[PDB]
Amino acid sequence: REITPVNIEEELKSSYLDYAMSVIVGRALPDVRDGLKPVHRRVLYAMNVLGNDWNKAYKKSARVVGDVIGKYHPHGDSAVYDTIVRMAQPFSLRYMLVDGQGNFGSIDGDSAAAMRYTEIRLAKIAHELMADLEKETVDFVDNYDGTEKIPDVMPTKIPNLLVNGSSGIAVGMATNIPPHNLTEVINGCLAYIDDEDISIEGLMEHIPGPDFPTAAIINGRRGIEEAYRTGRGKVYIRAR
Amino acid sequence: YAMNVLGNDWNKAYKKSARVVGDVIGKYHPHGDSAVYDTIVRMAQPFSLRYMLVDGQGNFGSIDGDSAAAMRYTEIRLAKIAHELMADLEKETVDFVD
Amino acid sequence: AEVEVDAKTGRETIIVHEIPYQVNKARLIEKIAELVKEKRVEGISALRDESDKDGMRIVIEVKRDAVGEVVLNNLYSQTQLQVSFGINMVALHHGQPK
Amino acid sequence: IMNLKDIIAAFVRHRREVVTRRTIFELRKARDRAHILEALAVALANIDPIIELIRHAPTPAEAKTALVANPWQLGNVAAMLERAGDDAARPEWLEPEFGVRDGLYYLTEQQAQAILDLRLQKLTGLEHEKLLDEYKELLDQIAELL
Amino acid sequence: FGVRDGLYYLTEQQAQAILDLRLQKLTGLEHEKLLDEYKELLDQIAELL
Amino acid sequence: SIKVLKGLDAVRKRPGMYIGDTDDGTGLHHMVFEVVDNAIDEALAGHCKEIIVTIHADNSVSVQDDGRGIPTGIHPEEGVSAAEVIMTVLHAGGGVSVVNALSQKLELVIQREGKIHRQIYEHGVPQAPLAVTGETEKTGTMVRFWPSLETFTNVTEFEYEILAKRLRELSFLNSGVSIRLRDKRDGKEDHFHYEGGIKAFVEYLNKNKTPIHPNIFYFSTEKDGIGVEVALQWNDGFQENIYCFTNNIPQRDGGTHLAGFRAAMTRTLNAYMDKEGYSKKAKVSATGDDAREGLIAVVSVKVPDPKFSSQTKDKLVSSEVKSAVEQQMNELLAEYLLENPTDAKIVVGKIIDAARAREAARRAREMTRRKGALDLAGLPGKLADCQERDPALSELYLVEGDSAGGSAKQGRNRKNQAILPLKGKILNVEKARFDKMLSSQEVATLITALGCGIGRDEYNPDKLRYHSIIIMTDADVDGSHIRTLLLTFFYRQMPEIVERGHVYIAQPPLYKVKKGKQEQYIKDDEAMDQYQISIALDGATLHTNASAPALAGEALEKLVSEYNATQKMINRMERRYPKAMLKELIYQPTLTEADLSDEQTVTRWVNALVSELNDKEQHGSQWKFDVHTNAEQNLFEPIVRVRTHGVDTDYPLDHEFITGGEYRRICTLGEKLRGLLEEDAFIERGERRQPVASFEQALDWLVKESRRGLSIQRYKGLGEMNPEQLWETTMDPESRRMLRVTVKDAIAADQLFTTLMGDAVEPRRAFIEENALKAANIDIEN
Ligand SMILES: [Mg+2]
């Protein structure tokens, strides 16, 4: 009735398992098909719906953040703006997805301006990740209030996960993937389509290793093969 | 005017305050957003206006000095008497500016 | 405000129902407490707030050798139980102040 | 925990699924458009009886329910309809008692409704030729998709 | 333009409106609706004047 | 007439889905109760309003009334008497026809207009048209039926007490109706006739007990389409018994017509006791539980269109009954108390005795010092302290932030409730050091507010200032994380507080759903699914053919629940088999284990399955089959091959799959589902009508129909709720639900805390993988 006894172990286990599963499945790890976290996909879809194309006028960041918060993402607005800022920095992504106007920080440590100053619009390559979206190529799900529809995965023509990488922290596990080069990945995909039985050594003839936006020098060739063969490895980067 | 354009009528569902603030800032008001939100809050308190113009949902402060919640929690919509201030707006009764 | 007298003991208290426009209740209570602490107003023993869903209710208790009306007048004179409002009607007419 | 080959294979599988679904969607849309175009083209060969039937009707519902009462002769569209081989352009949800049965056409409710929404400017022959051009293009697209 | 002597003269927009007429407008019931609207329009014009 | 044969055959094929269980002995009495309900509804306008129920020696039952007879006219469009139409026809889509169909012989006698009529039915088929036998001068109707021996097994004899209880209750509820129950096998008679109504009901219940006051409270009014009747009395026991009814249908779980009763009683008793000065003379304060000891009451309402939680009633959820009961109770109980002083004195004496008895079950609690206007007492500035000085009658609430803090402060009870806000996520003391914990600010504020000390050197558990600590966070996952952190802190630093039982957990809601003028609060997703299912089936009837009575609500609900469970089980195993293939095995004949070493049957079975799969394909897949020969046990395992997206895959159905529990559950569902709907089956909900061809189509149509006009509201935090809602949902002591934390085993708790909140990662990852990734494929299906 009003008061009901409960054991502490059951409550602790249930609450912690719920939180851990929610964090693992919906906040920190990317998908293997498009390489996007839910926030990135929701931001891209919201920008697409507004018709903020790559050959039109800019729009203020506050409007986009407000739309995203009010229709798809039930969280705070500072995190969304911080996520948007990172997708427009040339020194953070190998291929930027957002085109920006204003002060978006610097490699020297300067912070970006407030969201009441900047303007954004979609990049040209970002349209290739949402091609044929209106021809029933993917599934749709409901939002938190059950009044909208959100794509479950993007029908991309670009292997975004390898070319842009990922990084995140979760409960009990973490991820770290470096970026690569587009032409080499395309050649590797063509070779796989041709053979579908090619070994790891055959694939490395087209993809020698990673490629960083800041150039520099990779010292040593070991670690790359181990990472490509098993999934874990360590490499060294040296300045010029 | 922004709330009227959004179609946020008095007999429909509420909308998030952040969306309205973003629309106002991005299309009509070239200033900050905190001041706009504070202005929106005052038009919904029963102890500040004799006839309120905005209907609110959530914590909007009290007369004891409590502050209103952040704009990521509350929801608003137009009041019934507010529709009388914008009647016959589409029949060329006033002038328009850029 | 008014004064209520106990039937048996004869003790009298002051009950406040409403406050002037644009006045904070917490600041008023703090000001009264500060005045009592520094011994600038005499004849106050207890002070607490009992406002609930029914309405506002502030209780002030006087000492054994004090008159409630004198204390009420002193509170009127020194605290924000009475305030002044200055009317100044200025508006834009044909784009000009008037 | 994955390696390079798994990621490449997953990307290829995703591409295959996307292309298949897109092709199915396009085929369905093309078949529906061709089905509408056939009924639109048939009505232009019997303009006078249709006009008389519509004029004598007191209510549009009565005209709609009287349109699907008797078969209509093909006339000049027999050669156009002969090009459609078997059921290439036939929608998959269409019952066998409709369409061309024996030198005659049997309309449905949707086709009858489509006729009542025809502008008076469609009686020009230019639109008549446009119908044939669109029909041929739709047939070619259906063949390619199949 | 308009009625001059037992005859009617049309304009470009009036001719354009004729070409955009649906076939269902030839039904008997649809014809009588125009005459109903004409009287209401005349009454509204009189009241506004 | 052939349609009547189809209807009767449809009823007789599956009797259990129309009348109830057929072996325990429930429908055997449900038929009699249905006939009696029809008779009592009809005979309400009779001159004497008398009903006679007789049990004969040849195991038959007859019901007779004295009202106006059933009309004996002839329908122009049917050519038959109206009585036959009533007894046979379904009366369009959406209760005597079932009884006629399930009885091997029924005799009907109708007398009106100075004539006597008679007809005989055999298995629902009339033997002759209605005929006149004689002339009379009275009116009435008699129905006598012999239950069929081909459908009712095990218990096949009527009882006497089961009928007696229900008939007595019906006589109590319907004032002015006389019911006689006669028996012939042994010889017994009874006569139920009470004009008092609910007062006699209360007297009957409170008979073997000892009442303490002579008078009985009673009233009966009607505000707007709603009628309320209440009667209550006090005895000298220590029990509570309240009986609720709605349109003569009992509810065992209460509803909206009980909360108003309880609240009104509490308010009226507290107000009277405070005004009369009885509380001041004593040194105790009463509560709701003390008032409701040794109490017997009956509540009955009349509502035009009631709404319940499920199809088995047991709970009322109509939102406009609570105020109707509460206002009348508040208005009239004070008047009752004012007129009779002796009963008031006795009742308040008993309540005071109980309240004082409660007080003697506490410990020694010295008085505390409360923060006030004239004294801060060195307490944190964010605390909103109460006015009660006794720690045993005080509560403390912990909230996440300032918005929730303000929302709770605006809707609390200032007398004995306090609020203390926090700031975001708190430090994890399991991974931190003692000096780091001391240097924190939120922990220091919490320690100062508790006032017990820290470090286990000056930490005295007897200095606690509040004997009730309540954790109230948001309803999302971050609230759960913060709750775990707070529990870790309390267990690791102050074990004695948890051991004594001073920690509670609150349960605020997450969703609010509104449809029309109906409102309701939803806690989590499971309640959301239950609400969707409940509102989908309200006012819906299913007919298996053109002319057949609609199925019972309970059977339809059970079928829906079983189908949903099977669908969830199928969805949980999509990684190993195609879902389309699994969904098709429900409608295919079961493949027994014996039919595996014989061959020539597996081939036909798989061929039929593949043909059916290829018939309904709409995504471009192609299905082919193969048969595998085993040389060990001479078995024959089916093989299914498919090609999707240009990729060939093979799925073999081996011996293990056949004997598994998943296929057993699928076959169990199929046995009920197979062959149910005939060709001309139709569904309807209210006024809309829709022909259907499959169960899934009808279910989807009902779900789509039920969602029109529905509104859903989600609360991100407590700052999104109005103060009154938060009060009435979580903070009101009369209408709140909470939990008390206890410890079962110390070793297990310590190990679990170390594993989950510790620094090492590998044990935590292993635990998460074992509990979450695995143990979800439950292969029990039982
Ligand atoms: Mg929150």
From Swiss-Prot, chain D:
Q: Give the signal peptide range.
A: none
What domain of life is recorded for the organism? Bacteria
Q: In which compartments does the protein localize?
A: Cytoplasm
**What does the protein in this record do?**
A type II topoisomerase that negatively supercoils closed circular double-stranded (ds) DNA in an ATP-dependent manner to maintain chromosomes in an underwound state. This makes better substrates for topoisomerase IV (ParC and ParE) which is the main enzyme that unlinks newly replicated chromosomes in E.coli. Gyrase catalyzes the interconversion of other topological isomers of dsDNA rings, including catenanes. Relaxes negatively supercoiled DNA in an ATP-independent manner. Negative supercoiling favors strand separation, and DNA replication, transcription, recombination and repair, all of which involve strand separation. Type II topoisomerases break and join 2 DNA strands simultaneously in an ATP-dependent manner.
Q: Which family does it belong to?
A: Belongs to the type II topoisomerase GyrA/ParC subunit family.
- Domain remarks in the Swiss-Prot or TrEMBL record: An N-terminal fragment (residues 1-523) can be reconstituted with GyrB, but the complex no longer has negative supercoiling or ATP-independent DNA relaxation activities, although it is capable of DNA cleavage; ATP-dependent relaxation is inhibited by novobiocin and non-hydrolyzable ATP analogs. The fragment has ATP-dependent DNA relaxation and 30-fold improved decatenation activities, unlike holoenzyme it preferentially binds supercoiled DNA. The C-terminal domain (CTD, approximately residues 535-841) contains 6 tandemly repeated subdomains known as blades, each of which is composed of a 4-stranded antiparallel beta-sheet. The blades form a circular-shaped beta-pinwheel fold arranged in a spiral around a screw axis, to which DNA probably binds, inducing strong positive superhelicity (about 0.8 links/protein).
Q: What else is known?
A: When the enzyme transiently cleaves DNA a phosphotyrosine bond is formed between GyrA and DNA. In the presence of quinolones this intermediate can be trapped and is used as an indicator of drug toxicity. The enzyme-DNA intermediate is also the target of a number of topoisomerase poisons, including toxin CcdB. Few gyrases are as efficient as E.coli at forming negative supercoils. Not all organisms have 2 type II topoisomerases; in organisms with a single type II topoisomerase this enzyme also has to decatenate newly replicated chromosomes.
Listed name of the protein? DNA gyrase subunit A
Q: Which residues of the full protein are shown?
A: 344 to 489 of 875
Curated annotation (Swiss-Prot), chain F:
Q: Where does ATP bind?
A: 65, 311-313
According to the record, the residues making up region (ATPase domain) are: 1-196
Q: Which chain positions carry the site (Interaction with DNA)?
A: 425, 428
Q: Which reactions appear under catalytic activity for this entry?
A: ATP-dependent breakage, passage and rejoining of double-stranded DNA
* Binding-site residues for ADP, renumbered to this chain: 38
Q: What controls its activity?
A: Gyrase is the target of many classes of inhibitors, including coumarins, cyclothialidines, pyrrolopyrimidines, pyrazolthiazoles and (fluoro)quinolones. Coumarins bind to GyrB and are competitive inhibitors of its ATPase activity. Cyclothialidines also bind GyrB and are ATPase competitive inhibitors; they seem to act differently from coumarins. Pyrrolopyrimidines inhibit both GyrB and its paralog in topoisomerase 4 (parE). Pyrazolthiazoles also inhibit the ATPase activity of GyrB.
Recorded GO MF terms: ATP binding; ATP-dependent activity, acting on DNA; DNA binding; DNA negative supercoiling activity; DNA topoisomerase type II (double strand cut, ATP-hydrolyzing) activity; metal ion binding
EC number annotated for this UniProt entry = 5.6.2.2
**Comment on protein domains:** Consists of 3 domains; the ATPase domain (residues 1-220), the transducer domain (221-392) and the toprim domain (393-804). ATP-binding is cooperative, and both subunits must be wild-type at residue 103 for supercoiling to occur. Non-hydrolyzable ATP analogs (and ATP-binding) induce dimerization and enhance ATPase activity. ATP hydrolysis induces domain shifts that are probably part of the mechanism of DNA cleavage and rejoining.
Protein name from the UniProt record: DNA gyrase subunit B
Q: Which organism is it from?
A: Escherichia coli (strain K12)
Task: State the taxonomy lineage.
Answer: Bacteria, Pseudomonadati, Pseudomonadota, Gammaproteobacteria, Enterobacterales
